[PDB]
Amino acid sequence: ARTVVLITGCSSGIGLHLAVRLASDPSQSFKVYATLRDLKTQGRLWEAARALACPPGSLETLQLDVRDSKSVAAARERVTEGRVDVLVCNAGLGLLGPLEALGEDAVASVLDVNVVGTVRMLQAFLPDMKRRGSGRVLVTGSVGGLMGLPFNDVYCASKFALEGLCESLAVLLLPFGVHLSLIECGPVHTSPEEVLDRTDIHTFHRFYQYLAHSKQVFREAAQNPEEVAEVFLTALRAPKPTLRYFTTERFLPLLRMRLDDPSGSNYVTAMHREVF
Amino acid sequence: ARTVVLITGCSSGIGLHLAVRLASDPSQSFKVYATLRDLKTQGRLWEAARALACPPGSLETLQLDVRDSKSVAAARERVTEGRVDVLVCNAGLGLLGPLEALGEDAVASVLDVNVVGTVRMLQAFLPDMKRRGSGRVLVTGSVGGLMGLPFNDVYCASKFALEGLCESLAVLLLPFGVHLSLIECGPVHTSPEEVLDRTDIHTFHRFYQYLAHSKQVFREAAQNPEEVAEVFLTALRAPKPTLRYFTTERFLPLLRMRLDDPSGSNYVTAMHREVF
Ligand SMILES: C[C@]12CCC(=O)C[C@@H]1CC[C@@H]1[C@@H]2CC[C@]2(C)C(=O)CC[C@@H]12
Numbered sequence A, B: 001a002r003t004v005v006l007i008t009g010c011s012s013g014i015g016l017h018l019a020v021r022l023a024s025d026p027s028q029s030f031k032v033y034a035t036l037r038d039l040k041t042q043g044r045l046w047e048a049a050r051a052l053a054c055p056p057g058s059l060e061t062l063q064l065d066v067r068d069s070k071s072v073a074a075a076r077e078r079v080t081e082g083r084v085d086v087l088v089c090n091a092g093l094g095l096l097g098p099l100e101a102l103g104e105d106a107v108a109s110v111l112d113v114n115v116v117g118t119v120r121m122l123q124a125f126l127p128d129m130k131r132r133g134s135g136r137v138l139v140t141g142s143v144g145g146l147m148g149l150p151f152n153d154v155y156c157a158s159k160f161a162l163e164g165l166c167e168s169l170a171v172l173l174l175p176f177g178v179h180l181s182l183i184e185c186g187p188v189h190t191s192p193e194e195v196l197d198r199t200d201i202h203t204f205h206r207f208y209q210y211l212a213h214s215k216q217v218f219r220e221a222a223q224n225p226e227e228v229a230e231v232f233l234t235a236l237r238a239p240k241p242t243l244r245y246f247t248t249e250r251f252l253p254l255l256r257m258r259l260d261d262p263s264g265s266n267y268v269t270a271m272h273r274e275v276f
């Protein structure tokens, strides 16, 4: 029997590349359900699928909006095999800007998709895994879930939230045979006027500095999505998967600094100098 | 001039005791605005206030529901001094139980009060602090924001979120003269039938084990709220406050273990054995 995989957020980036990587595996081991918020965005997925020659029936798309528990339930009912071996919670939103310039709705949305949406998926698929005593859950994490990044306050809040959520569940799930892992990604290749109206000129200037810095880090360190997708596959095949996989060791030093001074002083000074 | 303090979540626990500690300070240094979601719950606050002989005018209550940006704005307008020197974001909800037994509304509420509510307060009060180049923000943190706890998945998600939010803002706020600090608290002195219907018997049994364990930890380690409130005062008077204050060193070893094995393996095994 094939390994049934259901992946959220497949219209672009990591989820699109993971879905076609699995569906096109030479062994034909996987049956992938690539889910998307809006089916109008599925063209790139199908263009990639043909480029990798995914066999007919290896990949199927479903509409799944993680903000709606009814959409989660209807997608679950569409898994014809009646089981999900691997669940990949990857749907996510970013949010960048001065905290006081962010709309209340944008903040609530980032938390509803990134955090509550993952809870909705776990509530919908975890119980059957627990009963069977088998199943793999992979969650797309971020270096921003491990350390705070300026002008990413709500995005980091959401990614930190996934760390707490997953770590808490892992403690309980240890003896159930259900394995949860976070795949910790760094940067991956995948109007000023309005910001200025909602913040001070000094914060505005620091935002520019952050953006200039971020562009350089991205140009220098962004990983190809194929390399990142492969870390998900590595986690899936591990007999005894760990709670966290890192796609790069680039940020481990900063993470260790952070983790070694619980007052936070060293990290805050170090990251302020790094960005600014 | 007095130091103007505005504190959220003052109907009980840490916020109630902090508010009366500040208002009754022998130096009469502070003017406290003790805010509460529902004014019908203000009796304990006033009973404590009289017990500590808070001078007339040292303490005032305002209705403030952190889920509503209009309520945040109306409370801000009630600060007669037209400035807040110290903002204490303390309002918070717990949530305990098997993840699949939690209501979707309860999950969304925990994140809206704990995380989005803090964002609403920071958006409403941060800009004036940044302009003035002064102000202290203290956020009630938890050991559950630093390490994942079984059957506290969404509660830990929310507290981890505050860590990411605050750490991200601290990096930017470093040179502005505005100081943000998390006050990391351990336990503080402050139907089975429905859970069983929504989960499996094994998870139900593990929940009982968790509860029995938690009761013993609480009986042995819960700190008096007066001792905890004093750590907020210590942070407020520090000339150069750190990002994090710990109310106890009891959990530092577990935190260090966690922080020293980024794969998460050591922590997950250690905490599973500790609780179960
Ligand atoms: C957010 C972003 C850039 C945007 C992204 O896609 C993720 C990546 C994560 C690492 C961040 C980087 C921006 C620049 C940062 C903040 C550094 O200088 C070190 C950590 C870096």
Ligand SMILES: C[C@]12CCC(=O)C[C@@H]1CC[C@@H]1[C@@H]2CC[C@]2(C)C(=O)CC[C@@H]12
Binding pocket: B143, B144, B149, B150, B152, B186, B187, B188, B213, B214, B217, B218, B274, B275
């Ligand atoms: C959640 C709770 C108990 C409930 C609370 O008020 C906070 C406190 C934080 C530390 C927790 C503890 C429960 C038992 C735990 C999980 C341990 O055995 C170590 C960490 C402990």
